[PDB]
Structure 1
Amino acid sequence: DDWEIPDGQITVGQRIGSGSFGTVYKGKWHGDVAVKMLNVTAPTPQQLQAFKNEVGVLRKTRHVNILLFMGYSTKPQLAIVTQWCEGSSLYHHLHIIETKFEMIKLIDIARQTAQGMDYLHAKSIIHRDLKSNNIFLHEDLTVKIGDFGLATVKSRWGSILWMAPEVIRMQDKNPYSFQSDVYAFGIVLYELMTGQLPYSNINNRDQIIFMVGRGYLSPDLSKVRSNCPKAMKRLMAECLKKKRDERPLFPQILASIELLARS
Structure 2
Amino acid sequence: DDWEIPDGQITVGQRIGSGSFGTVYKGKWHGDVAVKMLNVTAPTPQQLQAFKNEVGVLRKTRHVNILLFMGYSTKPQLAIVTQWCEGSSLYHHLHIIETKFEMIKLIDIARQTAQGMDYLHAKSIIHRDLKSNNIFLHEDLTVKIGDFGLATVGSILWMAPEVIRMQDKNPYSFQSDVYAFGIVLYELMTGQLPYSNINNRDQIIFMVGRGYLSPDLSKVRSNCPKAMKRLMAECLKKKRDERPLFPQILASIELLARSLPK
What's the TM-score, normalizing by structure 1? 0.93
Do the aligned partners of residues 34 and 20 (structure 1) sit closer, same or farther apart at CA in structure 2, a change above 3 Å counting?
closer
- Give matches, 1:13-28, under 5 Å: 13-18=13-18, 21-28=21-28
The count of corresponding residues between Structure 1 and Structure 2 is 259
Q: Which runs of 5+ in 1 are unaligned?
A: none
1:82 aligned counterpart, secondary structure: strand
Instruction: Write the distance in 1 (CA, Å) between the matches of 2:183 and 2:41.
Output: 40
**Structure 2 CA distance for aligned equivalents of residues 36 and 128 of structure 1:** 18
- Separation in structure 2 between the aligned mates of residue 148 and residue 62 of structure 1, nearest angstrom: 14
- CA 88–185 in structure 1, closer or farther in 2 if over 3 Å, else same: same
In the alignment, the residues of structure 1 paired with residue 124 and residue 131 of structure 2 have an alpha-carbon distance, to the nearest angstrom, of 19
More displaced stretch, 200-209 vs 250-259? 200-209
How big is the shift at 1:30?
A: 0.4
State how far apart, in whole Å, the 2-side matches of 1:229 and 1:215 are. Answer: 27
Aligned partners of 1:89 and 1:152 also within 8 Å: no
Greater mean deviation of Cα atoms: 130-139 or 140-149 = 140-149
**Contact 1:133 1:148 survives alignment (8 Å):** no
Q: Which is worse superposed, 10-19 or 72-81? A: 10-19
1:88, CA displacement in angstroms?
A: 0.9
Which SS does the other structure have where 1:25 is aligned? strand
Against the structure 1 CA distance between its residues 20 and 67, is the aligned structure 2 distance closer, same or farther, given a 3 Å change threshold?
closer
Distance 1:152 1:61 in 2: 13
Change (3 A) 1:150 1:55: closer
Q: Which residue of 1 aligns with 2:80?
A: 80
Label 1:83 to 1:113 Cα distance change in 2 as closer, same or farther (>3 A): same
**Does 99-108 or 17-26 show the bigger shift?**
17-26
Distance change (3 Å), C-alpha of 1:149 and 1:121: closer
**Shift in Å, 1:19:** 6.8
Deviations 1:39-61 (A, max 9, x none): 33332322222111111001000
- 2:150 is matched with 150
CA distance in 2, matches of 1:24, 1:180: 26
**CA–CA distance in structure 1, aligned partners of residues 125 and 246 of structure 2:** 13
Q: Which residue number in structure 2 is paired with residue 101 of structure 1?
A: 101
Deviations 1:105-153 (A, max 9, x none): 0000000000011011001111111111111111111111112889999
Q: Tell me how far 1:11 sits from its aligned partner.
A: 1.1
Name the % identity. 100
1:104 offset after TM fit, Å? 0.3
Matches of 1:257 and 1:100, distance apart in 2: 21
**1:201 positional shift:** 1.9
> Structure 2: how far apart are the matches of 1:88 and 1:19?
14
Structure 1 residues 216 and 14, CA, compared in 2 at 3 Å: closer, same or farther?
same
Unaligned runs of 5+ in 2: none
